[PDB]
């Protein structure tokens, strides 16, 4: 009763942090070993026959006793109580990843705004010094702590 979803294990490497890279290696190698351990087991052996073991074992009562106590023996699947935590933590990291998504959308929109500004620039033939300081303030003479002419220190 297995529900399996195999991934290509490249995005598993692209998806992990530096903080949990060793634990991701441990979980990856343990999952590889556990998939191989699944693959080594066939699904079930056949049921224990009772005509042959009833004819062999002459101990009366014992063969029908073991037949009744074995063929009417059922044991449940060992439970989990962890899938709910895994799915809720999945939903929480998806919600944090969605707010990270919308913040990156605003960031790339501001990038595109600056780029469409910068392609549509004065072609430097009509450019004044004041408009060149307006288009970027990297090169503005500050005139504070250098308030005299020229407004850089001379050695620069």
């Amino acid at each position: 009763k297995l529900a399996l979803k195999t991934i290509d294990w490249v995005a598993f490497g692209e998806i992990i942090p530096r903080n949990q890279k060793a634990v991701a290696n441990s979980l990856k190698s343990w999952n590889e070993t556990l998939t191989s351990r699944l693959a080594t087991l066939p699904e079930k052996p056949p049921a224990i026959d009772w005509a042959y073991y009833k004819a062999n074992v002459t101990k009366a009562g014992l063969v029908d006793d073991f037949e009744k106590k074995f063929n009417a023996l059922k044991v449940p699947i060992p439970e989990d109580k962890y899938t709910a935590q895994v799915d809720a933590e999945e939903k929480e990291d998806v919600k944090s990843c969605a707010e990270f998504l919308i913040q990156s959308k605003t960031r790339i929109q501001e990038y595109e705004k600056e780029l469409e500004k910068m392609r549509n620039i004065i072609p430097f033939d009509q450019m004044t010094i004041e408009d060149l300081n307006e288009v970027f303030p990297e090169t503005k003479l500050d005139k504070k702590k250098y308030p005299y002419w020229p407004h850089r220190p001379i050695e620069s």
């Binding site: 399996l4 598993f12 699947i77 933590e89 999945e90 990156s104």
Partner: protein
């Protein structure tokens, strides 16, 4: 590229999910194999004692 890594965020958690599912199914199959082993032991012991 960070958008592309945002899109792929349903793979790690799927690896944890099917890891837990495979571990539990292997454990139940080990229950099955184990009780088969001990009832096998009982019947073979009775047969060898009779022999």
């Amino acid at each position: 590229s960070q958008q592309a890594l945002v899109q792929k965020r349903h793979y790690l958690f799927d690896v944890q999910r099917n890891n837990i599912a495979m571990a539990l199914e292997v454990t139940y199959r080990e229950r099955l194999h184990r009780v088969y082993r001990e009832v096998k032991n009982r019947l073979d012991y009775h047969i060898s004692v009779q022999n």
